[PDB]
Design a protein around this nucleic acid. Sequence first.
RNA 1: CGGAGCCAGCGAGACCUUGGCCGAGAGGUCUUGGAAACUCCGUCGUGCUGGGGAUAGAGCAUUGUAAUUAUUGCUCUUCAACGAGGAAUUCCUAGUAAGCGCAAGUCAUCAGCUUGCGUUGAUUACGUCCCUGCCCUUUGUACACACCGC
Lengths: 42, 134, 38, 28, 62, 206, 22, 49, 205, 247, 128, 142
Amino acid sequence: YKLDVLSSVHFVPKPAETPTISMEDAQPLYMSNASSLAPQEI
Amino acid sequence: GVSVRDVAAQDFINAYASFLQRQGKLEVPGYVDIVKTSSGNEMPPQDAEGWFYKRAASVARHIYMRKQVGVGKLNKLYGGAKPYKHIDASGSINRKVLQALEKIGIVEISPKGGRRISENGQRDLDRIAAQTLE
Amino acid sequence: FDRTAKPVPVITSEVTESLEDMIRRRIQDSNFDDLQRR
Amino acid sequence: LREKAKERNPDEYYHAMHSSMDQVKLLK
Amino acid sequence: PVTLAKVIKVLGRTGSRGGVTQVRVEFLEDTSRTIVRNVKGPVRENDILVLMESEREARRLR
Amino acid sequence: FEVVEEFTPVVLATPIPEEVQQAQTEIKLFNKWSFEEVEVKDASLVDYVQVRQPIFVAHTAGRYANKRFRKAQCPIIERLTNSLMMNGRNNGKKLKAVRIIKHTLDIINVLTDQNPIQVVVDAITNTGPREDTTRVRRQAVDVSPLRRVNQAIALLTIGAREAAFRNIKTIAETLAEELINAAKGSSTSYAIKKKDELERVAKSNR
Amino acid sequence: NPYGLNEVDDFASKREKVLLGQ
Amino acid sequence: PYKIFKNTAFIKDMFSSAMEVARFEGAQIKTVSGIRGEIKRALSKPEGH
Amino acid sequence: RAWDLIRYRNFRTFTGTERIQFNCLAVDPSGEVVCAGSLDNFDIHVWSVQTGQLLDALSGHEGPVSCLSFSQENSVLASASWDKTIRIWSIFGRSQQVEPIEVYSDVLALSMRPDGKEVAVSTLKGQISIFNIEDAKQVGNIDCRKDIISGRFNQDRFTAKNSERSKFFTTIHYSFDGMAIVAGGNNNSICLYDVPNEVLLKRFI
Amino acid sequence: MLRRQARERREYLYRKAQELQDSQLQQKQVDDEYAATSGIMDPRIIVTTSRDPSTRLSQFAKEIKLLFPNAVRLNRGNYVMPNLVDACKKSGTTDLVVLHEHRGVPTSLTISHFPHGPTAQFSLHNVVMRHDIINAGNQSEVNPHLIFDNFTTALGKRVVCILKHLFNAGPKKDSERVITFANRGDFISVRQHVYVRTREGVEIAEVGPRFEMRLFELRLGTLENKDADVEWQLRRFIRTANKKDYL
Amino acid sequence: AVPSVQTFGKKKSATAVAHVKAGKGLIKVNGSPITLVEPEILRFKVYEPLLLVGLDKFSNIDIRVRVTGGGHVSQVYAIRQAIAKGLVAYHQKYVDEQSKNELKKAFTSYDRTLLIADSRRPEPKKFG
Amino acid sequence: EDYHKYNRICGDIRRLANKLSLLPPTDPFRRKHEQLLLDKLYAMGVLTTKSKISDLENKVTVSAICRRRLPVIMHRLKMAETIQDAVKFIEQGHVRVGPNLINDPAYLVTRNMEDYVTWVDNSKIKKTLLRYRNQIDDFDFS
RNA sequence: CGGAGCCAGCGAGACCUUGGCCGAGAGGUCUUGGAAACUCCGUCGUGCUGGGGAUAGAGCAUUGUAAUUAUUGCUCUUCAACGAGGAAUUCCUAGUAAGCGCAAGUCAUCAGCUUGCGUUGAUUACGUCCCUGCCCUUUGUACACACCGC
Ligand SMILES: [Mg+2]
Ligand SMILES: [Mg+2]
Ligand SMILES: [Mg+2]
Ligand SMILES: [Mg+2]
Ligand SMILES: [Mg+2]
């Protein structure tokens, strides 16, 4: 980040128990893991 | 405001060559009818009667274009290809032409050597330049 | 008199025979100085 | 001198970039 | 009489001789009719050829 | 209704000949021949005999060898001039070809009052072989329009050259005669003879 | 060169000074 | 020498004919200054150069 | 990286031999060839989608490759660079041809007409120039310097009118009808032009 | 662009200087120019000639093109040397080969490695072309096996590296084409043979061409640069020249 | 100061420098009128810009072109390119930009080489 | 003149690299990150030539980072006689790094971008250069 | 063929020279400083002809050297082979083929030869594996989809 700011033409923002909620998911919620596998993979 | 540079070269040379012939005052050497103007050439000029006068007109225009000119420059100016040697033009003919012109007052001996366009010749060449345009 | 530089070699039949013998020996042992993928 | 001419930066900027015979000598 | 036909497809992998191109051309008189012809020069789609005879069908010249 | 964009007579300090001003009015080949009325009679040759862009002189310095069909866009007069210079001794002398073509157009106008550019177009159109042969014996095949244009130009220029190779006729006159005869379609022109011979041989092997 | 030269520009400058010395 | 082009130079008066030069081609030569040289080839014209 | 959006997986990843940083990308209409450009290499790397191998590197640009695009129909590749030139690559076929076109200034953005017969480029001079690909000749030009609205930054020591920080468009795109171009850049204006008549249809703050 | 070339030359010269010091201290691998692409990217070679070549030189240029699997012949009509190398660098060419002649007899061969050198200049002796063979037939253009014989000195290793990288890496074990560079008193004999492994040995058949190449210059730069620092040059007028060996 | 602009045209070794200032329509090449440019057969090439946009635009300006290098043909191309570029630049600097755009459109539609240099840089067409 | 920030950058490079030395050599995790740091510094231009981690300990210096400053870069390129003049040109907006105008003198040019630092097209400074050479072409507006 | 018009870029270890005067030319003598092709207008004209310039004769000069020795130019006269080239064969894709000149001889090679530089600048093809030749594959191995199936 420090080097990026010094060499960036434009603005660079600074990079950012209990059960947790996943704000972002890699796949749609309706999509199922089984449907993510090819017939060859099965 | 007419000038030689405002007129085509061939038209001016032909028109001024006629004027010198018509004037009849340009000294012409006797050997004009026997010479070739260059060792590289093979025959004498066909226009035997008037080639010398055209030579003087061509030389006079060059004196205008370049303020100072000598026989050496004219020799290379009219020289040409013949391996190849690029022989320069005959020195005798050019020398007689330069001397002939300054008899009429068209040209005169320049400082630091060479020939300069005389002020009387300066108006004279301008006179025929206007003649060709009109 | 001396000569300034090395004379250009002449390729006679013996020189060829020695050269081809080296080539055949190299092929027989499969000893080739050739580039390989890295 | 040849490399110096070869590797000359065209953008180089310098503030300096902004800026009778006897009678003739006597007259001048 | 001589007919005019516009090239619509430059056929490939036809096995023709070098310098000969097999093409499909539709007659200008009737756009529907199509015929397969052999051409000698550089040919591209949408250019017009003059067929002396409109009956022969092109065959591979090997 | 009138539209006027010039309110003062235009007079330049440098004199310009009035012919150059009539050229300002319209672009004409050598400031003497108009392209407006010229049309390619044969439908197939259209898009390969390019006459729609008027040019004052043939010399263009365009880039037409880069791609496969750029030659079709080249003006036909320039193609004729380019074809004119061959045989080694004439290689690279484009100005001589330009002068020869100018003189040929003058001769064509004198003999025939028709527009010389139209005569050239008619000759190139007529002398293009519509059918040819390929070696297997021989087999008949069709001919692409680009090849027709190329071979027409080649035949006309070659015939005009060979006619005057060792004859009193100059290249300009023989080229004018070749173009006039080809436009007429008469068998006198060498190119028409060759075209008829090729088409006949193709018909034999059809 | 208020902040000096890198390794490459030091080598280049030395080479130029040598040739100028010749 | 009678004609010099940087390192190359044309020599005369050493030999009388181009035949003699051919015998001495590649021969080692030097100047009075000590500059070492070589006989490269015989000139066709004039003889001996 | 290639992403399969029916199954949402990265089914393939492409990379150069020496870890070249990529700035622009273009995909063949057949979905069988992928091309990328860089600001440090000057070459356009080409990969095979099915195999993932480097087919070859297209060379010829003397500057960094700023932008790429395949014709959706004719499948030609158009590339532009800070070399003040545009090159049309006919990569598909037995023989490869390149047709360079010169431009007055550096090319920042490039857009391909949907029919594939023309290409538009936005230059550092604030010009949108349209070229005919088959003939490789310019067919139209649009001025954009005056239309662009750029505000004076709070840190500026020079006026906005005198400022030249961004009076060009770094991104452009054709309308699917082909008759309009929307342009944007490092500025506060989005200008929508009409290609055939070369006028500003509307400007958005 | 010109700034990038100027900067990279200084880096190239600095790198060779440091490598020379590193070699010297070891005295007390592949060269840097070839290290980056050794065994990854196949060479790209352009074979050209001097201006207005004779027909024999054109034929010889064709034969040299067939020698190297990835060579392409280019006509040098009016091309300017700075323009020639700049065009080659744009097109991704790795090496450039220029041939000279005297009355249709090849005399010299210079190899320039891009983007920064080195440039090696050779003189060709006893050149025998394949056009001089009747009913010779066509060549085999498989990636050939390479033989480098009697290269011992550090300069000899340098010459081998330059010649080795003109060919594609990884020939098949059973490729029947072999190209040999044999050093015999600094005169490198170049032969091309096709071999057939017999049950009791090997038999080889010469394809050609034959020619002896002797290095006389090696400069750290492309052939355009007459000011490139000379890595090595052949001294001819030293008193030991008639017997001194270098490779 | 008199409003004036300077432009360059190039073709091979031929380089032409055109100076365009306010005037009365005086076009000169190497100190001589444009009508005397040689060779005569190519003279209309040098006229192509002047005839394309019309002589009225030149009636208010004086153009002086100095040409050096190259041969006859390349010198003619340098002259025409320099004249076109100079006219466009003057119409930009001392006249509206609408006329600039019209001139550029005309010249590019006719022949783009009038404005952009035509350099046939070597290209190794054979890949490899 | 305060080099507080660059000392922190130089120090942070030292602390980070030291932690990599602690991690077991055969680990792939450290080897990848060490190369990324070397590649990053090489890209920035701090390391003129590719270096090892041990060299990276001592080659990194405040002067190296200062050399990458735009006004210092311009001085070596001879665009400005003196650093203070270079800073003034940057503030007045006469200099562009690639297609982007940089008015912040503190900006550090990366290795690739070094070749494309130049004057803006319409700079009066640029016109002074071309006028001195008598190479000013008004078609390019400069 | 005769005039006239003109346009380059490489290159720098007494002899070169701008200029004046002689000579038809070649070339002499007295002094100062240290490009061709090409374009315009003319003559000629299908005749081995005003294409070609080999051989030969006579003179006017230069360079040494000491000979009446060759050497290098110029003037006139003489006026040949050569009428587009068999069987065959080599090369060639854009600033390319080809034409034209100019400069330097920078450790190999080169001496009317080598290299470089500039000038003018096209025809055709830019498609196919049909013929020839040189290769590659016939364990998808290849990350989804699609296609394929010993
Ligand atoms: Mg003359
Ligand atoms: Mg091909
Ligand atoms: Mg040639
Ligand atoms: Mg040669
Ligand atoms: Mg030769």
